[PDB]
Write a protein that binds this ligand. Structure first.
Ligand SMILES: *[C@@H]1O[C@H](CO)[C@@H](O[C@@H]2O[C@H](CO)[C@@H](O)[C@H](O)[C@H]2NC(C)=O)[C@H](O)[C@H]1NC(C)=O
Ligand SMILES: *[C@@H]1O[C@H](CO)[C@@H](O)[C@H](O)[C@H]1NC(C)=O
Ligand SMILES: *[C@@H]1O[C@H](CO)[C@@H](O)[C@H](O)[C@H]1NC(C)=O
Ligand SMILES: O=S(=O)(NCC1CC1)c1ccccc1
Ligand SMILES: [K+]
Ligand SMILES: [K+]
Length: 498
């Protein structure tokens, strides 16, 4: 529909420049003719989700790499993809002119963009906020009569969420997560630092905290917003750490288990919001499987927990098989969901690297890795940041797929945007991962899924410098002869006749 306007900032690849009168966009989505496949290609050399079509062939010869679709080998259903509407994201989006705001939101939420269907909503303030607040800062208000949404919600976040939902043709699911409780419920009486809820699960402090979740859901419902899920606490391990710099609330896994069993589970289940799902953990993967064991082996907690939320700090190394793999083996009926991912968080790397292909490859490699370990969705962190990677009240700056430059009324779409879009645009909610078997050892990363309507999607990432010819075999349908260029990502789509 409209191609990428590239700009280089001296990193390995380009950003696409958008402004008040121009942004890259796709045509309305249409499938290739039966017997035809679509290929969307992005490359370090500068291609951005460019469309080509090719024939599906009856025959194949050669000893080249063959990836054979296993359409009846079924794995997880996919919930979807999206990102977080933090205070920082909202402020950056609304600092753009109305036309640029629209093109940014269309980029993410419309069918002319990459089709996000998840928005994560912080419950009150976090690090990506410029003001520290909760919804119930008046002390000793245990019945939460003075609970209320401030302007960060009513004037910034909620109107933007409504605008995203208007642009979306896919149903959008909202996920809520709190960072801190009111300080008068906490052992340290501060939003940050080491501290937990006072007392013990089942007591007034814990009951009040559980009621705060229902108050939040009630308040958003008055604005005609309903949630798909809540997490039990953002990064519960953080509040156990001396000097933790920003909003947190510490829970051991035993504390989280008992809070869920005695307070949050029953309180949600007794409310009009009983259909909202509860996700546990919302933290880094090295806490698994231990955290899952502690919480889910208690039947009283387990009956309230619908899923496990995991965060991915892509700058840091940690095992996948010993964490996600083991958790799936031990608790195959509890879904895993990636609720936050980010890059650029190390103090010694530029928070925002405009045009970094490497950071793009980190996003897509992460997503593939998550999907191969049974995870049902993937949620980026801040939807948009400034060129510093902010604002952020403790200067904990990071990268974002969209960077806003208010002085030019411009925003920049990073390689990370396109790497995420290779999945989000082409994997509708309810898609199911299926097998994909390589005929020989190779350097590629790939995943295959089947749409609800039976159509096929395959994503192929090449993190190597070498162009790799390959064939995809769909045993019902035929062969797709293609090539995976070095430093590329491709998405393949086709109809499957039986
Ligand atoms: C928004 O960006 C577009 C794209 O760069 C700008 O339009 C370009 O303007 C230059 C300079 O006049 C021309 O050489 C290009 O041909 C234009 N491209 C297109 C596609 O129109 C546009 O001026 C910018 N808008 C604002 C309000 O700054
Ligand atoms: C495909 O395979 C068989 C090989 O004998 C042949 O009958 C057929 O003509 C070949 N070519 C095409 C285009 O199908
Ligand atoms: C359960 O729900 C009702 C609302 O119908 C409420 O009045 C009651 O206090 C709730 N019980 C709790 C939160 O324990
Ligand atoms: O994968 S999709 O079906 N994504 C969803 C779209 C609304 C139908 C698709 C198909 C054709 C072109 C782009 C994307
Ligand atoms: K208040
Ligand atoms: K940094």
């Amino acid at each position: 529909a409209r191609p990428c306007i590239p700009k280089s900032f001296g990193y390995s690849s380009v950003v696409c420049v958008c402004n008040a009168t121009y942004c890259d966009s796709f045509d309305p989505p249409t499938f290739p003719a039966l017997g035809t496949f679509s290929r969307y290609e992005s490359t370090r050399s500068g291609r951005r989700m460019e469309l080509s079509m090719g024939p599906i062939q009856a025959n194949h010869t050669g000893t080249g790499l063959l990836l054979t679709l296993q359409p009846e080998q079924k794995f997880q259903k996919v919930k979807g993809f999206g990102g977080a509407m933090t205070d920082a994201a909202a402020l950056n989006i609304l600092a753009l002119s109305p036309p640029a705001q629209n093109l940014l939101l269309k980029s993410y939420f419309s069918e002319e963009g990459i089709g996000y269907n998840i928005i994560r909503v912080p419950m009150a303030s976090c690090d990506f906020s410029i003001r520290t607040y909760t919804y119930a800062d008046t002390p000793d208000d245990f019945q939460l009569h003075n609970f209320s949404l401030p302007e960060e919600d009513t004037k910034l976040k909620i109107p933007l969420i409504h605008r995203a939902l208007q642009l979306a043709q896919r149903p959008v699911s909202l996920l809520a997560s709190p960072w801190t409780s009111p300080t008068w419920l906490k052992t340290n009486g501060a939003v940050n630092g080491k501290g937990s809820l006072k007392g013990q699960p089942g007591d007034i402090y814990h009951q009040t905290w559980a009621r705060y979740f229902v108050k939040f859901l009630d308040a958003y419902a008055e604005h005609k917003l309903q949630f798909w899920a809540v997490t039990a606490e953002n990064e519960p391990s953080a509040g156990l750490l001396s000097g933790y710099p920003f909003q947190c609330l510490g829970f051991t896994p035993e504390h989280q288990r008992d809070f869920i069993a005695r307070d949050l589970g029953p309180t949600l289940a007794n409310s009009t919001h009983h259909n909202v799902r509860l996700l546990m953990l919302d933290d880094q993967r090295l806490l698994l499987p231990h955290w899952a064991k502690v919480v889910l082996t208690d039947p009283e907690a387990a009956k309230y927990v619908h899923g496990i939320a995991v965060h991915w700090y892509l700058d840091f190394l940690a095992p996948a098989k010993a964490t996600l793999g083991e958790t799936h083996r031990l608790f195959p009926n509890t879904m895993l969901f990636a609720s936050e991912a980010c890059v650029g968080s190390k103090f010694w790397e530029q928070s925002v690297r405009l045009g970094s292909w490497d950071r793009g490859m980190q996003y897509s490699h992460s997503i593939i890795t998550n999907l191969l370990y049974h995870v049902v969705g993937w949620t980026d962190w801040n939807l948009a940041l400034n060129p510093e990677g902010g604002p952020n009240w403790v200067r904990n700056f990071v990268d974002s797929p969209i960077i806003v430059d208010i002085t030019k009324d411009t925003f920049y779409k990073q390689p990370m945007f396109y790497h995420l879009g290779h999945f989000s645009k082409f994997i509708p909610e309810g898609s199911q991962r299926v097998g994909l078997v390589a005929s020989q050892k190779n350097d590629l990363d790939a995943v295959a899924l089947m749409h609800p309507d039976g159509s096929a999607v395959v994503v192929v990432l090449n993190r190597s410098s070498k162009d790799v010819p390959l064939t995809i075999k769909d045993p019902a349908v035929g062969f797709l002869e293609t090539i995976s260029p070095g430093y590329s990502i491709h998405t393949y789509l086709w109809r499957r006749q039986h």
